[PDB]
Amino acid sequence: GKIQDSLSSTASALGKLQDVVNQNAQALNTLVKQLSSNFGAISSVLNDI
């Protein structure tokens, strides 16, 4: 019962899994956003340039 209550009332108990998920999500977001960079081109869109 005590461990159940601690898990219910504590938000940092599952820090490891949430941190791993957040790291993966932010890595994916950074990879997606890297496309926005033009690297000297007029626009990042291949068709437009």
Partner: protein
């Protein structure tokens, strides 16, 4: 391949229940990629996939 008011993209347009604002025209997501468009011809919102 949809060209809406100069915004060019490729995807499937489907009816959307999203509620835009009168001044709002385009849509975006967490990864700043186009997700919804308000057609100028008629007052409705179309998603992109």
């Amino acid at each position: 391949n949809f060209n809406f008011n100069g915004l060019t993209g490729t995807g499937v347009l489907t009816e959307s229940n999203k509620k835009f604002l009168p001044f709002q025209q385009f849509g975006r997501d967490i990864a700043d990629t186009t997700d919804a468009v308000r057609d100028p011809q008629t007052l409705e919102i179309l998603d992109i996939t």
